[PDB]
Amino acid sequence: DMIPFVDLKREYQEIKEEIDQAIQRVLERGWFILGEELEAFEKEFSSYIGAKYGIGVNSGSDALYLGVKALGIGKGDEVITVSHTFISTVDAIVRNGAKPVFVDIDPETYTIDVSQIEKKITERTKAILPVHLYGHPADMGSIMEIGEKYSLFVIEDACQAHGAEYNGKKVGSIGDIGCFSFYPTKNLGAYGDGGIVVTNDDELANKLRTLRNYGSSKKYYHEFVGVNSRLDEIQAAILRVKLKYLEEWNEKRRNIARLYNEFLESSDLVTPTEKEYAKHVYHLYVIRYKERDKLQQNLLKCGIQTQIHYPIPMHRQKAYLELEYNTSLPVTEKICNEILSLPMHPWLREEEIRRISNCIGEFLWMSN
Amino acid sequence: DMIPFVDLKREYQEIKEEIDQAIQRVLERGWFILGEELEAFEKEFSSYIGAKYGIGVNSGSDALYLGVKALGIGKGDEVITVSHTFISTVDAIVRNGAKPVFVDIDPETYTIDVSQIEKKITERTKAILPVHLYGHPADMGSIMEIGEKYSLFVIEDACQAHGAEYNGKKVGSIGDIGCFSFYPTKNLGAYGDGGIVVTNDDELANKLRTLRNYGSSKKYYHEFVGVNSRLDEIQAAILRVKLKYLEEWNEKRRNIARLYNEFLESSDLVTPTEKEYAKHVYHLYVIRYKERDKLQQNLLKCGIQTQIHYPIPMHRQKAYLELEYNTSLPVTEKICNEILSLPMHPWLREEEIRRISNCIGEFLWMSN
Ligand SMILES: [Ca+2]
Known part of the structure; x- marks a missing residue:
């Protein structure tokens, strides 16, 4: 379940x-x-x-x-x-x-x-x-x-x-x-x-x-x-x-992204962008929300597992603190506090997408 | 064949x-x-x-x-x-x-x-x-x-x-x-x-x-x-x-080594040694011969595959010649020119070992 x-x-x-x-x-x-x-x-x-x-x-x-x-x-x-x-x-x-030498990200695309x-x-x-x-x-x-x-x-x-x-x-x-x-x-x-x-x-x-x-x-x-x-x-x-299945499986991922976008674009959650220059293949479906910790707990209570990619950015990891140059990455630091990955793979069933959407909708209602 | x-x-x-x-x-x-x-x-x-x-x-x-x-x-x-x-x-x-820091080998055991x-x-x-x-x-x-x-x-x-x-x-x-x-x-x-x-x-x-x-x-x-x-x-x-089969398969290898030793110990080939302290598991069955390249060529003519482990020792490889490795290791240098690995795995038949012996005996005749 x-x-x-x-x-x-x-x-x-x-x-x-x-x-x-x-x-x-x-x-x-x-x-x-x-x-x-x-x-x-x-x-x-x-x-x-x-x-x-x-x-x-x-x-x-x-x-x-x-x-x-x-x-x-x-x-x-x-x-x-x-x-x-x-x-x-x-x-x-x-x-x-x-x-x-680190460069900050674009907040829309999460890329350099x-x-x-x-x-x-x-x-x-x-x-x-x-x-x-x-x-x-x-x-x-x-x-x-x-x-x-x-x-x-x-x-x-x-x-x-x-x-x-x-x-x-x-x-x-x-x-x-x-x-x-x-x-x-x-x-x-x-x-x-x-x-x-x-x-x-x-x-x-x-x-x-x-x-x-x-x-x-x-x-x-x-x-x-x-x-x-x-x-x-x-x-x-x-x-x-x-x-031989990769194009089919990426089309399945893109169709799931379209369904999530239908339910979530109007919502307080910031949905992922596909730029005009891009064909996005949605390895991950990543949203941004001001209270992503509260949202993660509420999704788990509804029986939905989520993950974060990634909550500690590389310039803040212990492995690099001594060797790295001094750096300032305010967008990266803010994004890592706000992101959440929703289930996304070619085998998600109808019973799953609508259920995930309904959990998020009920949460945002009760929060507002 | x-x-x-x-x-x-x-x-x-x-x-x-x-x-x-x-x-x-x-x-x-x-x-x-x-x-x-x-x-x-x-x-x-x-x-x-x-x-x-x-x-x-x-x-x-x-x-x-x-x-x-x-x-x-x-x-x-x-x-x-x-x-x-x-x-x-x-x-x-x-x-x-x-x-x-390199040291030479014992010529009997091929070990440090x-x-x-x-x-x-x-x-x-x-x-x-x-x-x-x-x-x-x-x-x-x-x-x-x-x-x-x-x-x-x-x-x-x-x-x-x-x-x-x-x-x-x-x-x-x-x-x-x-x-x-x-x-x-x-x-x-x-x-x-x-x-x-x-x-x-x-x-x-x-x-x-x-x-x-x-x-x-x-x-x-x-x-x-x-x-x-x-x-x-x-x-x-x-x-x-x-x-679960490793001990049985190593016993098969050891029985093959015993049969090669019966055929070849009295021959011009130097057969591998097992010291009193050792249980040898014969990953490789390695002999020494003064003209090992001519022996390898003749074995291949008989349909027998052999290998050399290894003809260029590490101190003479390009990767470590480029750092100063003028190390002098006369046993290593001599035996890398003389070694040859004979077929050795758990599935060789006694009559296949006899075929390999016959090819070596005919070669030693024609060489002497
Ligand atoms: Ca591997």
Whole structure:
């Protein structure tokens, strides 16, 4: 009777026969690492995004970390990014020995405020790392203008944005590299950890294939210090099945967002925006409210689970307090106190959306 | 007609029903990350080794890397280890900012020469990292005496040695931590990447669980810069099945080694040794021969696949030539030119070992 924030059981039941067939093929072949399923998924996913090359890795975290590393970013370099993002966006910078320089967000889109990027550029800047947060693209026209003018790499964190578009172009295909997660709750999810880097640069693609394979480019050789970060054959096989459903499942998410907007736009809750330049894929459906703690408790009393993405922004996290530059991010700090994520996934039932709307309506009545 | 180096298809067919049931349980549960299969596998595997705690991670490479990190080893520190080992043993040290200090091997066991450790200790030394190479234990009594005398951590690289014993104690249970790989060809192999750290220290176990989970100990917090390095529920479930067979499969490997020794000990090939203190589990069956490349070519003509573990020792790799590694390790340098790994896995037939023997005998005739 509780409405959980996610329920991956529903997905498996919808595609059980195709998933079981894919897994069985890999077990029968006895080839689990760096095989034909991974090569085919890399080709299929890169073709879907409109990039020449795909390089499957163990996680979105590693896609970002290895992408920063392959671009030669490290000690003495700066990367401009947001504080309003998941951990791994900033760890990708710090683990390479570079330093983040934070920019505030646009309060409408929850993405990097492109009017505040240029004032952060120094002689040490090497890249801009925009985040397509919640499934909405960052304003990539302004970001690419700045990257061209200042000769900076553009690294897209598309981990929440599989299939999102900026002026009709798939996010992840615009910057030098695009990074995605296949964590199981992502819009395209594996049944374990996974991720990918996409690029049009063959030399960068080759460097990423060496780095992910213990820093070995040919059998017996160790050209530089690398990692073990590979997308398993079994997960690649699962992802080839699910990729064929991704456009359908994103349309389901967008239809749920349309229904929530019908019930909530008129309400005191600030509903998420889709800009004219955007195709939003609603990895998360995020509202803002002055009393979001009171609203979260009331939704739970109605049997509805919610989450916050994320209540402590990265510039306030213990991991970074000593190493980070001094920064002022008033919009990020205010937003993180006001946001709440409502249930959002392709398998939410009619009985769920109207029930969530009715709970919010009754709450706002009793509050006013 | 070919005798391949490993046969993962034959493994799967032996335990297919149990494996398929384990995978189906995980898919039906819809819980893929940090679940009950991982918790149960960690308890089962740590109990098997004789350690209090198990921390499943994505790879042996990460078990070593995170183990070094959790012990506080980093910039300004030295770790004494071997050059005759896999890449990831040494990358674990360098990725943390510490410097490896190499010592030579014993030509009989291919493991660290314990008589050469003490002279390399400095004020910077924090640990010794012995490797239980090919499934034979290092001389752990000597290593633990040096660790006690000089107050050094001992980190066991047990990635090739699941179930091996040193004076009746399982390797991995002796040092401060034990690190294992579940790469598919290991004696206990997953169907994708996996690994584990074992330890008796509850504080170290807790730090490892934080580091592997994006450096997050509790929801919404990032206390430390960490990684995403987790053993997937599906792989934990598979490994719980295979762990019940590990002792039986290691006994099959030991019986194959006994048969190779009968055919080859009196031959010009140097056969592997088991010291009185050792239970060798033969992850690899490694011989020495003066013209091992010509032997490898002739075995391939007979349809027999062989491998070399490893022809370029770590002190001669490009990754660590670029830092000043003019280290002089004459045993390592000689045996890397002479070693060859013969087929070794639990499914080889006695008459396949006779075919391999016949090919070697005909080659030795034609060479002499
Ligand atoms: Ca993995």
